[PDB]
Ligand SMILES: Nc1nc2c(ncn2[C@@H]2O[C@H](COP(=O)(O)OP(=O)(O)OP(=O)(O)O)[C@@H](O)[C@H]2O)c(=O)[nH]1
Ligand SMILES: Nc1nc2c(ncn2[C@@H]2O[C@H](COP(=O)(O)OP(=O)(O)OP(=O)(O)O)[C@@H](O)[C@H]2O)c(=O)[nH]1
């Protein structure tokens with residue numbers, strides 16, 4: 108047989124490259140996943156991740172209370188935190204024993220998989236009572252924030268999209284919903300009558316994941332990297348695996 | 355009057371038979387319910403049931419954590435179980451005091467009502483981090499498992515459909531979503547523009563039920579039988595009520 | 602060992618000690634107890650008996 | 664065939680009678696069990712039973728502390744009861760918050776199976792520090808109390824032997840051991856060199872049972888009667904099953 112890495116007859120080499128290219132392209136086909144991640148960063152260094160994976164379109168919607176830090180099997184000032192919530196929903200509404208709850212997110216990172224169309228991204232960043240823009244009556248239910256998404260790149264390939272905003276001020280008390288549509292460069296409308304019921308089933312079939320990791324290191328090591336997910340850490344380092352035309 | 359059960363003038367008899375036939379046929383009409391049940395079986399003999407009832411289409415989607423046994427108002431090793439989850443999401447990821455959590459499901463039974471079209475059934479059986487097939491990039495978001503569904507029959511009538519799979523191995527750690535579409539032998543597409551917004555409202559109107567029963571006996575006696583639900587027990591016994599053309 | 606002695610006991614942890622008394626009552630006599638579970642996960646799933654090579658296998662009794 | 668209960672050809676009848684006679688006689692053979700039961704009666708009506716079943720010989724030995732009432736999974740004044748023990752071992756030895764502990768037995772019933780030789784029964788009824796007769800130096804380690812055992816009879820057959828003594832006084836604080844030898848009307852000594860090692864193995868193989876029942880009714884219904892055990896209740900009623908030459 109020919110010697111490895113010396114000719115066009117390195118079929119193991121050609122198959123390895125097609126294996127990777129097929130994974131990348133399958134993800135971008137209409138048969139592929141579109142994924143979103145919401146990272147809620149807490150002052151104790153811990154991170155709540157919410158992931159949703161689904162065909163055609165995907166989104167996450169969380170209340171103000173849902174995004175607050177929750178330590179499973181540990182104490183969480185549960186009564187005082189009810190009182191904190193009352194004071195966030197209306198100024199001087201509660202009877203809490205603290206000025207600032209360390210359970211409030213300090214920042215949010217939204218990440219989409221590379222199969223999303225960035226022009227379809229929408230976000231409903233509401234106040235603590237889940238109103239998008241001060242009062243319902245003058246509220247547009249979303250903002251198309253695609254222009255703000257940074258490309259997460261590895262070896263010159265886009266492995267994801269990231270929108271990051273800090274919540275460092277006392278008044279940064281939010282409810283949050285985000286949505287993205289899978290790329291579709293064809294003229295076959297996935298929601299037209301022929302396929303609309305598959306999109307309705309996709310709403311049933313979407314898989315969700317939620318967990319609080321103790322640190323960004325732990326998130327990078329045990330969540331991001333093992334699953335070949337894209338990520339952008341605090342030092343602006345990009346994580347992911349480049350697959351198109353690669354061995 | 356004619357004597358009972360001796361002539362074609364037994365109107366009480368004819369009405370009883372139409373009453374049953376009408377119930378069976380209403381369920382199969384586009385005005386009827388389509389229902390799914392997910393049974394998570396635990397080693398202590400207890401069973402978590404998740405039911406969803408809705409028009410046109412229906413589904414259930416649960417995380418790995420959501421399917422774990424939860425004893426309401428009792429102790430549940432809540433801190434150790436956070437640690438178990440960490441070790442299931444990534445090997446050697448946690449610091450648990452147990453090798454196998456008895457809260458993990460030992461088996462899953464999926465049951466659909468007889469108004470489903472078995473060819474529309476889809477299942478997204480993912481790993482513990484809610485990825486359908488090892489990595490997102492090469493994941494088809496579902497599998498059409500209709501061929502594997504067994505007919506639950508009573509008096510020769512199909513009262514439901516059942517897909518059962520055990521999870522007896524240490525590596526059987528899953529996230530699970532299932533979806534089915536109501537039968538529609540007509541050419542009126544329930545999701546075409548005329549009726550699509552009724553299908554969107556059906557997503558709002560779907561009713562969910564969830565409860566942990568202490569034993570299969572208790573499930574059969576107090577959940578299945580009182581509500582005329584179909585079921586298949588561990589001894590392969592079929593439960594349900596035959597209604598078409600019956601008194 | 603008694604039936605109770607072979608049941609799982611987690612030292613320094615919770616063990617449903619009251620419910621497990623009730624489990625025992627229902628194992629000693631059918632419908633004898635008032636437990637909140639069908640099967641106790643504390644019951645052994647298997648037993649392995651091992652003897653050293655100095656035993657005479659013909660003298661083993663169980 | 665002959666008609667039932669009318670001739671010597673009722674083989675079902677003859678086999679039923681041999682079945683019972685064989686059970687009775689097997690128990691009395693050297694291949695059979697010899698059994699002892701110790702019933703500790705508490706003022707709250709509850710009863711601790713200790714049973715031992717073994718070949719050739721059998722006995723039970725309990726400390727003063729071991730015979731005290733223990734409510735599994737409930738509160739038991741565990742610290743005060745340590746203090747009670749100190750005051751029972753030596754007068755004014757402890758710092759308890761009670762004059763009389765309701766955990767102390769109010770009475771003891773010793774019952775042997777009908778396969779025992781009543782002349783071999785021995786009891787070591789010691790004080791609270793496990794000394795049989797005031798001081799070790801003048802203590803015979805047992806008393807042969809066989810003459811005091813009453814025959815438990817059912818249908819004129821001996822189904823067991825009972826020795827009952829109440830402990831109604833403040834000073835009735837005991838440690839207790841009892842032993843009985845299986846009947847052996849032959850001249851084959853079960854402990855002679857030919858069979859001595861089988862007797863040593865019988866010490867390893869003896870099965871023990873211990874449980875606290877809530878009432879004598881409960882003991883009679885769920886312990887005594889289901890297992891065909893002999894018993895004598897507070898109203899002097901005999902329980903057991905007559906088996907010799909019976910259908
Ligand atoms: N600036 C400001 N924003 C408020 C206040 N109360 C509510 N908001 C909301 O908070 C959002 C702005 O938050 P930030 O961007 O963190 O505030 P900022 O003043 O721009 O401060 P920097 O972004 O850190 O420069 C707005 O879109 C408002 O909807 C307030 O008192 N001051
Ligand atoms: N067999 C196997 N499956 C694994 C392993 N790890 C994860 N899996 C997943 O588990 C699923 C198979 O589970 P099972 O069907 O219970 O395993 P099995 O080897 O077929 O064993 P049996 O069904 O009991 O005969 C696969 O579809 C994989 O996605 C593993 O180590 N061995």
Ligand SMILES: Nc1nc2c(ncn2[C@@H]2O[C@H](COP(=O)(O)OP(=O)(O)OP(=O)(O)O)[C@@H](O)[C@H]2O)c(=O)[nH]1
Pocket residue numbers: 829830831832834835
């Ligand atoms: N009588 C008596 N027995 C004691 C005393 N202290 C210890 N004992 C022991 O208790 C045993 C006797 O107990 P009981 O038979 O209940 O006492 P009793 O005086 O005969 O009273 P009754 O049997 O109810 O008539 C004796 O064998 C002693 O070993 C004591 O102060 N008085």
Ligand SMILES: Nc1ncnc2c1ncn2[C@@H]1O[C@H](COP(=O)(O)OP(=O)(O)OP(=O)(O)O)[C@@H](O)[C@H]1O
Pocket residue numbers: 221258263264265
């Ligand atoms: N929408 C897309 N989806 C998948 N790949 C894309 C997309 N747009 C561009 N690319 C490809 O990704 C690679 C990087 O192009 P990109 O435009 O991201 O890089 P750039 O021009 O160096 O940086 P930027 O545009 O961020 O300033 C190229 O191979 C490009 O063809």
Ligand SMILES: Nc1ncnc2c1ncn2[C@@H]1O[C@H](COP(=O)(O)OP(=O)(O)OP(=O)(O)O)[C@@H](O)[C@H]1O
Pocket residue numbers: 468505510511512
């Ligand atoms: N898709 C359906 N929905 C409702 N009833 C059906 C459906 N298909 C068949 N039936 C009816 O249900 C009854 C049973 O038919 P079915 O095919 O289930 O039985 P079978 O041929 O004996 O067994 P099987 O097909 O499982 O080997 C018949 O009256 C049949 O007409």
Ligand SMILES: Nc1ncnc2c1ncn2[C@@H]1O[C@H](COP(=O)(O)OP(=O)(O)OP(=O)(O)O)[C@@H](O)[C@H]1O
Pocket residue numbers: 777814819820821
């Ligand atoms: N040691 C024994 N073991 C088994 N059965 C015995 C024993 N001694 C006597 N029996 C038998 O048990 C039955 C009852 O005899 P037992 O002597 O117990 O009755 P009794 O003379 O009426 O009353 P008691 O002797 O108590 O005053 C008889 O069939 C007798 O042969």
Ligand SMILES: Nc1ccn([C@@H]2O[C@H](COP(=O)(O)OP(=O)(O)OP(=O)(O)O)[C@@H](O)[C@H]2O)c(=O)n1
Pocket residue numbers: 181182183184185186187188190202203204
């Ligand atoms: N603003 C507050 C906060 C707390 N408390 C009291 O302090 C007790 C303990 O506080 P809690 O907020 O419940 O915290 P933990 O019990 O420490 O934590 P968790 O409840 O999450 O286990 C509460 O029961 C509550 O009665 C209160 O009166 N007023």
Ligand SMILES: Nc1ccn([C@@H]2O[C@H](COP(=O)(O)OP(=O)(O)OP(=O)(O)O)[C@@H](O)[C@H]2O)c(=O)n1
Pocket residue numbers: 180428429430431432433434435437449450451615
């Ligand atoms: N891997 C583990 C498991 C438990 N623990 C400790 O043991 C205590 C009790 O265990 P937990 O898992 O909380 O179980 P329970 O309190 O018995 O039950 P629940 O919390 O569900 O009421 C916890 O607070 C935790 O500090 C621990 O340190 N490390």
Ligand SMILES: Nc1ccn([C@@H]2O[C@H](COP(=O)(O)OP(=O)(O)OP(=O)(O)O)[C@@H](O)[C@H]2O)c(=O)n1
Pocket residue numbers: 429614615616617618619620621623635636637736
């Ligand atoms: N069949 C049962 C089981 C439990 N309980 C009550 O629930 C309480 C807690 O249950 P228990 O069985 O004692 O478990 P834990 O306290 O969690 O564990 P342990 O006792 O082993 O520390 C008990 O005090 C008991 O009163 C009950 O009434 N009936």
Ligand SMILES: Nc1ccn([C@@H]2O[C@H](COP(=O)(O)OP(=O)(O)OP(=O)(O)O)[C@@H](O)[C@H]2O)c(=O)n1
Pocket residue numbers: 737738739740741742743744746758759760
């Ligand atoms: N003579 C005594 C008896 C009790 N106590 C105190 O009272 C507390 C509770 O009494 P205890 O005897 O332990 O009874 P419970 O806790 O009610 O029951 P248990 O310990 O059996 O669960 C103990 O911790 C002990 O410090 C004491 O100081 N002196």
Ligand SMILES: [Cl-]
Pocket residue numbers: 136137138
């Ligand atoms: Cl495609």
Ligand SMILES: [Cl-]
Pocket residue numbers: 383384385
């Ligand atoms: Cl219709």
Ligand SMILES: [Cl-]
Pocket residue numbers: 692693694
């Ligand atoms: Cl013999």
Ligand SMILES: [Mg+2]
Pocket residue numbers: 180431432433
């Ligand atoms: Mg706890």
Ligand SMILES: [Mg+2]
Pocket residue numbers: 184185186
């Ligand atoms: Mg609290």
Ligand SMILES: [Mg+2]
Pocket residue numbers: 617618619736
């Ligand atoms: Mg307890």
Ligand SMILES: [Mg+2]
Pocket residue numbers: 740741742
């Ligand atoms: Mg105590």
